[model samples]
Target chain A: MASMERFLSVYDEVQAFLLDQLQSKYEIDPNRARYLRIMMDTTCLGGKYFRGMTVVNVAEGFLAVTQHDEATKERILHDACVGGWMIEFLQAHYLVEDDIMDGSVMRRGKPCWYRFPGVTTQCAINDGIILKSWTQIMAWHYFADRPFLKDLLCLFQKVDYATAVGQMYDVTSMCDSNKLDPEVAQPMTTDFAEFTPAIYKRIVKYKTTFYTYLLPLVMGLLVSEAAASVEMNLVERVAHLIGEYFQVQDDVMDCFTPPEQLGKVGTDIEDAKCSWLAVTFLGKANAAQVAEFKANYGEKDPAKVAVVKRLYSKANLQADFAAYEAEVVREVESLIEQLKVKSPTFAESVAVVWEKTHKR
Target chain B: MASMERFLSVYDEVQAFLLDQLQSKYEIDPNRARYLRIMMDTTCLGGKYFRGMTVVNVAEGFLAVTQHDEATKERILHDACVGGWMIEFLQAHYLVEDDIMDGSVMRRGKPCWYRFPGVTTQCAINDGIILKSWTQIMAWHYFADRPFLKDLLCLFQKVDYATAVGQMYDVTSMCDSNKLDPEVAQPMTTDFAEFTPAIYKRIVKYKTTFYTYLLPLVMGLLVSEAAASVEMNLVERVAHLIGEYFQVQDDVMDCFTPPEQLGKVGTDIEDAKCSWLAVTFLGKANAAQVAEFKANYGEKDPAKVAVVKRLYSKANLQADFAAYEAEVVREVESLIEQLKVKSPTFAESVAVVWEKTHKR
Candidate 1:
């Protein structure tokens, strides 16, 4: 296992560098500077840096087997760092906007970026663009000379566009349900389940699996000249499944996890967030139960929140989520087994997959 | 003269292609689909395509001399079109977000994109990003094999980054001034003015002049296999100055033109747009005048708008602008004479430059 201490130190350094660059380049004022710093702190601190470490891990794995020169290794590490940081930046981009739109006060046991004193709501939008732009700039800076330059650029662009599209769809669906008509609201929220299966899949493919696992791993494989083999494709498929599993598990945890454990009160229900539990609950909900949910689930009242929780409990949403989680874990395990059978040297790959599954 | 009929036809075709691509690619619903279209239409309608036509004009100029094969001419035209359209896209990207932040009602004689019935303000923000990415993708598609592929990519990326930074400064300045104490607003707005001059220069150099004249004409020259000499450099210098003059004149015209002629009531003053006039006003205004001006300017009051205009009239702002414009025109004319001294072909260049000036 990678030491948390090591990754924490890197995160600290990365934060410092990000702040230094923002100040030196833009000369952001004290108030605006503090707002940006708070945003970075919220985003950079809460995440486990799993994707970031994967970059280093994949590069180190390549170095161990290929025995590349030190210069080559250094270059690979730099690419990995940038690749990993891109995912981190995306997290910040989405969550910062999400927090404001959702009107959440706390994130990661503290105030959200937009919740900071003196920060305007408009800053949230601008900060999202600025954060995402840094990711693109870093990608160009690191990968412009590499053989995979075009692919890397195209991939980053695709991910950004895809994520934006998915986010828009998510927002639109919620807006539709929040309309004045109660009859229309029920179907809209329910359709959120089906209106976005493809988007959810694409979001997992582009935002999570590819950037989180495939990017750094592929970078290492390309550096080691190992991309031509079927083994790499197999690794991608396995990583993708793991990524889907990870997101679905997140949905489950958002519902069932304790506030102390999760570090925030989950508003996935109150906010009408599209999640796996909502999809599964809607599937099994009877007409009366659906009516109850439509009446009591989608608004801001705490009584409504409790009522939605009751609906989820009554419909066995938690049980269904647990089963789905187990199934995905099995699927990922089988994928790993196949990778091991096909490419015995893929031991490190299985270890990484297991690490993601076990992460809180 | 280019036919407005022909331009409208071509514009529709391009808009259809762009809209279809966004719809199919994003799978946006009817509401979001309309939002995207409204934003693009408002953004695309107003401009003279002089900047866009430069690509074709330059390529044709080169073909006129070099007598390149049809295939080569086609390639150059296509490349130039892509470059020209990229600038248009950049303008849309800036304007879409700017409209939302500035709370503008009208753009291009129509309701602004954010004012559409189903369009949420946040959707306009995402639309801007989508519009920008389209340009980057178009550039990469056309310039993939050119020797200057990397150079062109860097140029466009730099332009995009600069525009975003300019926007950041612009928006922050607007917001900051509104919040500033009476004692600080004047210096703050002055500081904001300094931040903006470089952006105007950057836009002329990177977005307009190059794409409009230098790049297209030089690209044409290159495609024609014409040798670059002192004459070509002189043509470039003259073209750049002309582009700058054209922009500054447009800014000046914004202040003076009647609503019917300009096709919209001028709000650059009412909304406190960070235009050249605003910056110049900052430089010229005294403390008492600045105080009176702030009280009566940069807001929605019709009487206040009149007061602001009177203040500008008293300060001789338009006279200063006219003097600056004449000086710039003289400089450009001098450069054209220098170019003619180097090469008689500079006469054709002068004619082309005059054509653009006359159209504007």
Candidate 2:
């Protein structure tokens, strides 16, 4: 089992290592590098660390950490923490730009990076570029000696590509920048015709599955030397399964969960997101209901959003999500059972994430 | 040994190949992929293809295309073409973001990609990510079997990292997105005190030297199996020497050259860039002259920009650039002489690039 306390130490060290690398690799003095230092601290460190931690947990399961000598275990702990945070860094890179693309002013209980005093759109965009470059830089620094370095870097590249595709598809359906007037810039338009289950699943699988789910497990398998196993295929299957489940669950919570339970109100209906509930609600609703949903969906008005939610409530989406989540758990637990033969603790690595997302 | 005509054909083929890969790898339809196809066509293909051609020219020098058998020659031609366009793709990625950062509406004599009829700022940002991802995708698709694949990918990564560092440094002095008010949006303020020769060279070397000079030669060397030679270090040394000189020549042209000679007016003075002339002038100017220079340097008025040019003329920057340019040519040609013993055609590859940038 990985210690939560030690992972925090690793987190702090990698932050320092990332900054020190700026000086050694690029000759950026600390004064010049401080903007990035602040940006990184503000954006990257505030995450739940679940995505990176998943990598560490899965790697620990496969490596049988308790059996390894202290020195080797220490190294694994270091690298796995790195493996975790590198993905976290990649996530931050996207979020920095994603926030800009989505017109968000704050992230993670603070101002969005671009909203910082001196951090403007250009600064934030270039910061996004540097953040992405850091993953590659760190990949070479830490893993170049390993035989699997190419595979690891390629994995990072592939998931990034998949996520870009998903993001493009996402904004197109919502048309976040569609025009009425510069005078009224607050609301976005959604094309409800594009809200098919087929497309929604495509978005979830590529957008969420690739980086948020599959990447960590594959990275864990690579570091633990179990990547080439025939079992590797099942890991990907479970990742996609869980990813769609997680996203759909996320959509449900965004609407139905009380703010006390999740600490945030769901904005999907108002945001014009092609969420799972939207896809299902459209398919099941009558044409008049569709027109009613259309009029209220994506409106900035709170009353309109509540009207849209009333329809979702009438459609009984909570019962639908409960059914969907249970089916996913059954499939994933079966997949986890197959993994138990390969590594006794493998199931727990996947199991822990299920609990967090299932509720939150 | 490299044909300009054949390279055009290769460019077309790769464009199709890039679109096809979007379909195969990401499961995107041609319909859905058209936005990207249009973006790639607009941004990547309009340039003169000089940077990418450098890869083919250098690769052809070491491969001795005429001496090889036809089948081997053909394969080298295909791979070298890919090697070339991948760099072209990488350049396009940077230009897309750079144009956005600089707030330029036009590039290559057309509206920037974000200014397209339907392409919003967010669309452009995600498009930039996709363009970068293309390089990695093409690398794996084309070069995954090569022994030096990791090195090739890492080279791309390192140069990209360097360019981002350069871009950040370049912007910090200008602060393009800084504010006086949202009402007046056209002009930027510059911090002239930051324009030191050391910092200018650092910016040029990392920004211009790494990608513009070093990347192509290194890519060419890798594909031709000549990367590890004792001559390789000399290639980098010559690259930095030439990059700084080329940039200095560019700065001189920005002030003195007529629009007809380069087909466009130089805007660097109006833009208040940290050019070679700026650093030199800043060092030599008297206090009164410095105050006058600062007032006029970044102003939007033609009369004010003319006043700044008068100072550049007063300093006789034309003569300074000529002297600097000749010294660099002397150094680079001497380094090229060292390379003649290693590969017979290598020196010519470096010589022709010098001719284009020296005048333009």
Candidate 3:
């Protein structure tokens, strides 16, 4: 409870700091300023803070174990919170555009930023850039003088690029069937067979893993240790295992969890997303079931959505999810055990993320 | 003719290098790779290389004036061209989003990337980020070892932020009068009286000055010298004067030039842009003219566009443009003359840009 309180306080502090920077730094007019303030408040705030909290906890844990000096630990803790905020900012940046691209209506149980009054796709695009700009600016402010700053900036640059690539893949995979012209409407003809597990893994790695798991974890590790001291390849290997697990859980939650709990309703079926559940069900289903899945999937009609859900139930995906969860937990535990010898805090940090995400 | 040929060869080299990087660095599938390649070719190529050329010219000139060794100057010139391409990348990134936001159809004599078949605004948004990612990556590849890399990264970061802020200001100023409900669509009731020259100048400085002029020039200067060696404030002041001049010409060309020559029909009036011409005409127009302008401006009708043009003619904007052009040239020349004592090569580089832009 105390740790959770600490994490929330740090989150609040970063928000206030960023708001202050927006007010003082940019010489925008009052109306535009208000708009930006509202944008920051709506999009950047109110997240689960899974990524942000991970940065704070992991960094604090790393510092607590490694650093003997109190002042140094406190200072690094402050910096870690800023870094956590950068992660949050990156997530917000991606979400603002993702919502628009996915045509998402609600996020965090409210209308998406783009759906807000007086906002259009044009403003939303700029808002995404604004969030990114602040993230970079804050990173420079906090980490510019450190030896690890170059690595930090490059980490962000690479993750952003990879995420964009992942988004490109996601959007291109979807054939928007709503256009008037049949030829122009469906750019690609994707079916159940095309949603292979390999493709699913690839999308999740680029889109979810890099920013969500690897970035915060690696950033925390880098802040505590020298750039050369950390084994990045090993870090990535471990982080990706956990990342894939995190996203698989997300996919399951999307279908099974209620909108109130999930913050936004599942659009995977309607969105024609190459979600894990869809791919996993396809693996288990027979010929007629496969045909039915293809017909119902990616359709916007409520009846189609219901059909897809029925298919999932028939395939008994809940049992599959349970089995999958146990499998990932086993893999993650072994990885953490190996990691514990070198970095106990890092190992424990991964364990904390697993526990939080794996819960119903 | 020789100088033009030289510029073209360098442009080709940079394009090839960027293409090679795209192929090698990212693990994108062939289909998406092709999409990314097409995006790069469409947006980054075919520019006048105004900003890119400025970076090369300024850096080369700076090297020539400062370095006595011939080999050293040649070596740095090669590197400066890479920096020049980075500027081009940034320009391309901006253009992709700018076209979408402004609802432009044509760019560089082809359909805008967003308007390409099977492309949506979502993909275009990601494409812009992809361009930015390459810019940062290329910067790291070339300048990471240099002492001034931090300054370079920060310069890009600051310019990008400033550009976003400027874009926000520009968009928010124009009320979407086309919305079905007059009250809802017309979020803000903007008129000729409200399009003040002060607002025009502010928009120009933020949007055009920082990235278009100041960035390329200062980046070139920074590449050659340490952070403190170059006077950034003075560079900004002079570059802004030229930037404002450059955009004023763009505004003039949009209205007066033929579509074939300008590459796209001017939508500034129809788009409710806070153009210099609009503000300037507003300053000079009578009450009857103001009433007519308000009715005709920001409307989609070709006849409405024609009415705005006739009003500009009646206002003698061309003569005013001629006068404005002469005034800016004189101001620039005086600024250059003062700058020459400190950086003669920089002055000449500015002179080259002036000559090119002033011609059309």
Higher-lDDT candidate of 2 and 3? 2
B155-268 per-residue lDDT for model 3 (tens digits): 889998889888877776665323312113235454544488777888888877888988888877777763344456667778888889889888888888889888888888
Residues A161-240 of candidate 2 have per-residue lDDT tens digits of 99998888777666433342212232455446668888788888887788998999888777776665437777788888
Q: For candidate 1, lDDT tens digit of each residue in A1-360?
A: 243455466556566766665567544455555545655665666666776666566656666666767888666666666666776786677677666655677877777766555444544566666677667666666667788776666656665666666555555555542342211222335434343555456545644565555654655455445565337667777767777777777777787889778777887777676666666776788888877877876677998888888878778666776676688777777777776654444546556746766575
Give Cα-based local distance difference scores for all models.
0.62, 0.77, 0.76
Q: Which 10 consecutive positions of candidate 3 chain B have the poorest summed lDDT?
A: B176-185
TM-score of the second chain for every model: 0.73, 0.88, 0.89
lDDT of 1 at B251: 65
- In candidate 2, clashing pairs total 1
Query: Which of 1 and 3 is the better model by DockQ?
Result: 3
Candidate 2 C-alpha error for residue A22, in Å: 3.1
Specify the highest-lDDT model's number.
Answer: 2
Which residue runs of candidate 1 sit more than 4 Å off their true CA positions?
A: A1-46, A97-106, A110-124, A174-225, A230-236, A253-266, A341-347, B1-47, B140-148, B174-256, B259-265, B269-274, B282-291, B294-302, B334-359
Model 2, stretches more than 4 Å misplaced? A65-67, A175-191, A228-230, A253-267, A301-303, A341-344, B65-67, B175-191, B252-271, B301-303, B341-344
TM-score of each: 0.80, 0.90, 0.92
The two-chain DockQ for each candidate, comma-separated, is 0.21, 0.36, 0.39
> What is the per-residue lDDT of model 3 for residues A1-360, given as tens digits with 9 covering 90 to 100?
254566667666765666666568655555565566778778878767888778778877776556458877776777677778888989999998888777788987998887776777777788888898888888887777887788888888888877887777677655422331211424444454557878777778888889998898888876776334345665787778888888887887888899998988888888778888888998899989988988888888999999999999889988987887788888888887877666666778878877886673
Give every prediction's interface RMSD.
7.2, 7.6, 6.2
Model 3 ranges off by over 4 Å: A1-26, A174-186, A190-192, A226-230, B1-26, B68-71, B175-186, B190-193, B226-230
